[PDB]
Amino acid sequence: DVDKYTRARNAGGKRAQDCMLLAAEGDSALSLLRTGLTLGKSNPSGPSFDFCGMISLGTNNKVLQGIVQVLGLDFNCHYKTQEERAKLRYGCIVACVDQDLDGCGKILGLLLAYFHLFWPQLIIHGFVKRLLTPLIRVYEKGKTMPVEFYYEQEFDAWAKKQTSLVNHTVKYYKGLAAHDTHEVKSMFKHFDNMVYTFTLDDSAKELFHIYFGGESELRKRELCTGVVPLTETQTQSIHSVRRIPCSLHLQVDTKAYKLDAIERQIPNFLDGMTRARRKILAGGVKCFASNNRERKVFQFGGYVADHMFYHHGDMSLNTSIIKAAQYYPGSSHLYPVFIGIGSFGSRHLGGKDAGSPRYISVQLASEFIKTMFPAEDSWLLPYVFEDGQRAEPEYYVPVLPLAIMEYGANPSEGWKYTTWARQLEDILALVRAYVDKDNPKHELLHYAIKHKITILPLRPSNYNFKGHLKRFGQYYYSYGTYDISEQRNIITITELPLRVPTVAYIESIKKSSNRMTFIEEIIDYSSSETIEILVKLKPNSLNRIVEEFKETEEQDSIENFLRLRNCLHSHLNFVKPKGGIIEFNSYYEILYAWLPYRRELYQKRLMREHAVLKLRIIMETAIVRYINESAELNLSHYEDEKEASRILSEHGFPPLNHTLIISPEFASIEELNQKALQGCYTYILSLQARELLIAAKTRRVEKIKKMQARLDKVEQLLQESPFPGASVWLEEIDAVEKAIIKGRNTQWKFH
Amino acid sequence: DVDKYTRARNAGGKRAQDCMLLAAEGDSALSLLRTGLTLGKSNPSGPSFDFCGMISLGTNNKVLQGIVQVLGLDFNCHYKTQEERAKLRYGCIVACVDQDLDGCGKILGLLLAYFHLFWPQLIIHGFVKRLLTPLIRVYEKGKTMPVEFYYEQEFDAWAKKQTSLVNHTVKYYKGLAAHDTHEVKSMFKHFDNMVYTFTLDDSAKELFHIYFGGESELRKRELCTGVVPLTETQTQSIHSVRRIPCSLHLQVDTKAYKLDAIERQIPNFLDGMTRARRKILAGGVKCFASNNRERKVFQFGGYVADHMFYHHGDMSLNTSIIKAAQYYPGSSHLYPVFIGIGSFGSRHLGGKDAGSPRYISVQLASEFIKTMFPAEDSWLLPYVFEDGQRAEPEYYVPVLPLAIMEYGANPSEGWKYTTWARQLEDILALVRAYVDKDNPKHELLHYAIKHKITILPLRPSNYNFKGHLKRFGQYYYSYGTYDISEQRNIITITELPLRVPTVAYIESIKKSSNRMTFIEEIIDYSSSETIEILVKLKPNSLNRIVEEFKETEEQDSIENFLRLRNCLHSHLNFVKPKGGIIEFNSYYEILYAWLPYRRELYQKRLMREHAVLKLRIIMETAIVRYINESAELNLSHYEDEKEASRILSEHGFPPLNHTLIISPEFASIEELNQKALQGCYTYILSLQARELLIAAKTRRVEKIKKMQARLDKVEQLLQESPFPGASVWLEEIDAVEKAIIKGRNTQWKFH
């Protein structure tokens, strides 16, 4: 008699062991189970409300008390014998949950952990079972029976064997609510053979404690290794006999859920941004590339959700977009991705005083983004594929390491990740030394890469900070500035610590009762982007600070009475490109680790551009030849495109892939070579009449000469002394520095 | 001790009357005021923290007590004298709020009503003042000083005088957070002359009571007339002297806020959908017209927000989209706009058991939408312009009246608005009689339009309802069906009332203690889209049911013991096309009112199509002539497009607007005519080489003949006996009926 529970007719009777209990994840799962269990005469052999019941998931916890009650199961008794298990009201319990991150791995792990702790034997003897639903279904034109895969590895192997997939439609069912009516009927036609039973092995217990409870730091070693997908052999064993080990489930599904939660709040060290921020930046590039026109934040958030598969909520999306475009002293972004149009926030509230997204408008900082995040190597990066559709890249490789250049908070849990931005005069020196041959410290820096000698210094950025950055011991401290007016007995605060909000700071002083007694009222007259706080002392409290706070050597008496000093603690915790968590002892290590990724990207970008440019030279030469011969190869006399194509072939015109040459998109060199040459003659038949003019030929001929000149130049760039593309790096660093300086001269407005 | 309050230096002193208090709407407004009041030496003559303070808006209400405390003002005393007024801590209070719907009109109305209720003399004597920020700024290239308008009427008059606006950029500042840094400095440079004072007149007394407090049936008359914009004379008087009447504010801003709130939950009678639903349908048409490919609900919601200016939240957007695609017995939509892929809900939970939008996928019901909402008259409709951008249409005019054809329920926060769908055949009979000449009731129906004779019947739809619709008195009742099994002492419920959810119905019986005593356990074995509920009676309890509920004729004893009867209450509340609320006594009046709108739309669609088709005939004829003469007018010789255009003109080729003729879009007939022949020769120079082939000419020539044949047909269509386009309405109606029947044969899946 618990809620959302429908008993079976034979539950608790002589056929109790034949009965099974279905544990639905939510209301949508309950509706699907009700649909399947009531197929009627359409599924004579399928399950029904006889010998089957439903319960909703959604010792203190109420829902577990309901599952315990309906099962007629008791805590103290250990179910080591068959006779003891016969008393149970249901033969087994089946969990019906989604196959997403907030699916298998979290709800399943909690249910497995709950049953593992109290009653370990039930897992060994197969009391706990799981409903395995197809994950990927591939539909072929003209065929009504799809091909169903329960794992992505099987689909990947199948896709490799199938070669072209133009006639195949692939749909990803990552949740129980994604199944259509006909699909659900098909699943319940074979309900028996999709039920998989959990098994308990030796490895499970150590993994169960690691992932659930068991204090911590034994889970860190697990989470720094990344997700290892199930191999082909393991999956075949799963399908051969429907006995899924708990260990394999824990280290695939639960591990991925934990890693996904970590990656939400911890950035990648290559670009210093999380997956959500990467989607916004990639969505921002796509939105404003065609036309850099100002858009509302909620409109831009809708674009990101539609085009970058953002499903975490508009509130989180709008907040992240606002933070991305915020620019003020002590803001998280020293170089915001977007240009903030409107009141995006202030240092006094720590960015929490942003306007409503309906009125707040956003615009991409094209000058900074196009130079720091070049569009010609975004084709070259690995990309995230989500539900089979292209999403934001796995990581961005910018010209300069943003993970060192920004401020990172991660206030709640999340491996306590924190970063303090290094200044642009030390990062540039390191990178230029690594690249420029003529820099005297070029050889020294390379010798220091393999030995961690850190010859050059890295220091905190003092930009937008009217204070002192002093080094004491092994830590950096930021000091505020104060003014004392003896005659009016007023203490004026002109600057706060590095990342201390004004409103929060005033509350800290007021809450401190012992500090408070010396003052009577604090009034904040600080302007925007500048601190000016009036502190009114008691008539005779002028000295009381001096003889009470003892005048510490590191911290002044006023700097002790007023909390104008904070310690800069750096916790360099980052996500590896392949997954997992990497710990850096110092910032130079992050810069050293980022350097090879950009160096390879430059090298392989030139290879692709060389290949693409060679095809374009062939294409443009053919087009110019046609325009020269267009008069006597006049296409009017020929009937259709087939006859025209035959005539063009007879005259020695090369067939080319028209769309692939002009827009190679995301294509590897070998894929580029194999497809480009095999093409139609669309590049000739689609020429407009305006392209046959004399001026059109001259521009096309001049374009051919420029591409031939560029082709020779790129060949020279490949054979460079340090590494290919070294000279290109330096000129792109200069462009980035100019963009930053111009954006710093303005208030990151670029106008 | 008031939060978010910054006192002025001279507040409460000798210069208290010179002091003014700024009432910020929120944190964003507070930041803007802090920025403006601290311009420093950049604005020597502007306001500063001297003689100015800030308070946050955000008798029992806390903030109003805070405003009272900081002002040093007392309730009992009436401020009828200057000497009494001098005691106040601030000379005046200025409210800084947005100029949006949740801006002026709601927060301002509440503050004006609050001050008018207690201290009316303060409003007369100008204690309460307002900050009138510019609403629209127009920027011209090469000019750094924009043109600022405080009302939309002024901007409309200005735009009419300026003719072409290609060189002008228009930005709408409907909120305090939309002002950029340079704009805020410009506003505060002239802070004094943008402060407007509130004045109380004779009409304000009654409008304050009407819009705040008082009886109903008096605000109703105010809300059924629509919003009348301020005339040019009133705005000029407002601008000449900064004394804005309270009456004008109440009947423009507050009325619009109330009308917007009403329209959000009450639909237009022409299409039976609200503004939010209209955005989703219009966004759905745009999204799936290019490629009717299945999309996730959250992705589609992002598209709607980005393209249709939806800012009410993803949660409301996703819920509305889910309701639009829900299809089950008793659902709100008998003909859903979208095709539901996945578990969109069930009748048992009343649609509340829908899946998560991440897994739920949506797809437009293209076969039904195009027939019922033709794309060729969507250009002809009036459209909503929001922040200067095109949005969803003001209303849709479908082939059949959807406001009659759907189910409507609205929570009683306002007008009740309950609608029960009329039968499809009854609606078809009425409309066909109105249009078809040969229908014997054609003349009778027209004579009944002007006399409300309602000759033909309209009855509630019994589709997806296995029950009884009986008429008792003037009301309609829906009866469920039950089965009684004497041997097993079980009452089986096979059908519920028309729109009664299963779970809610079970709760009603369980929470009715008098009814419960007779039964011991209710178990729900109902399948999807079918009711099958088992009711277990006490061993002797059958008799007492009979001799207690008394077997009234209207309602059976079991139909009384089990609440299997419900009354269909019709509250025909709808929004007029021009604004306001209209009351309909019966469904025929709605159908009679909808008929002229579709009839006019058919008439004026033909005229536009006739005009458009004539231009296309000219353009295609010119193109065909060029292809015939392309050999001896070979454009290869001529240097550029200018020389080629001159040659084409010399040979007698008409210059035409290439883009406008092929896609006229939102263009009126006279605008179409004036912008058609004034173009260029792009329609010739942009012709591809594949268009010069012999087969291309034959298709183009055949196309010309078809358009000439269609042109003659349309001229015949204009001269029709009942009204122009009558024979196009009938064929359209048939297509809609076929689409509905095909969608009813399936489960609104269509494949």
Coordinates of C-alpha atoms in Angstrom, one line a residue, chain A residues 207 210-211 217-229 250-252 254-256 258-260 262-263 415 574-583:
Chain A
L207 CA 34.8 -1.2 -6.3
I210 CA 35.5 2.9 -3.6
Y211 CA 32.6 4.5 -5.5
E217 CA 41.2 9.5 -1.9
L218 CA 40.8 5.8 -2.8
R219 CA 38.4 7.1 -5.5
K220 CA 40.9 9.7 -6.8
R221 CA 43.2 7.0 -8.3
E222 CA 40.1 5.6 -10.0
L223 CA 39.1 9.0 -11.4
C224 CA 42.5 10.0 -12.8
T225 CA 42.6 7.1 -15.3
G226 CA 39.5 7.8 -17.4
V227 CA 36.8 5.6 -18.8
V228 CA 37.8 2.3 -20.4
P229 CA 35.0 1.0 -22.7
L250 CA 30.7 0.1 -11.8
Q251 CA 33.8 0.9 -13.8
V252 CA 32.0 1.8 -17.0
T254 CA 29.3 4.7 -12.5
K255 CA 32.8 5.8 -13.4
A256 CA 31.5 7.8 -16.4
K258 CA 31.4 10.5 -11.8
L259 CA 33.7 11.7 -14.5
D260 CA 30.9 13.6 -16.2
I262 CA 33.7 16.2 -12.4
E263 CA 34.2 17.6 -16.0
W415 CA 38.6 18.6 -6.5
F574 CA 42.6 19.8 -14.7
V575 CA 41.0 17.3 -17.1
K576 CA 43.2 15.3 -19.5
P577 CA 42.3 15.4 -23.2
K578 CA 41.5 11.6 -23.2
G579 CA 39.7 11.8 -19.9
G580 CA 40.7 11.7 -16.2
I581 CA 42.2 14.2 -13.8
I582 CA 45.8 15.4 -13.9
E583 CA 47.5 17.3 -11.1

